Homo-oligomer: A and B are copies of this chain.
Amino acid sequence: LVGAMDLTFVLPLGLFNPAMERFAAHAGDLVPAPGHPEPRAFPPRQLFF
């Protein structure tokens, strides 16, 4: 009765948001120091879990 269970998981790499959902949740979040490139506009190439 102790038994296993198999699952398959789906994760997206590198995809891109639709046209409506490229907003920021507020104007003044997640900004770096004022000489730095704001890399949040870059298309993602990574994933974190």
Contact = CB atoms under 8 A, between A and B. Distances in A.
A31 to B, nearest CB: 4
Contacts of A30: 23-25
- Work out how many copies of this chain go into the complex: 6
Interface size classification for chain A: 20 to 34
Contacts of A35: 41
Contact of A27 (B28, B39, B46): B28
A36 to B, nearest CB: 7
B33 A38 contact: yes
Contacts of A36: 22
Interface string A11-34: 000000001101111111111110
5 contacts: A24-B30, A24-B31, A26-B31, A27-B27, A33-B41
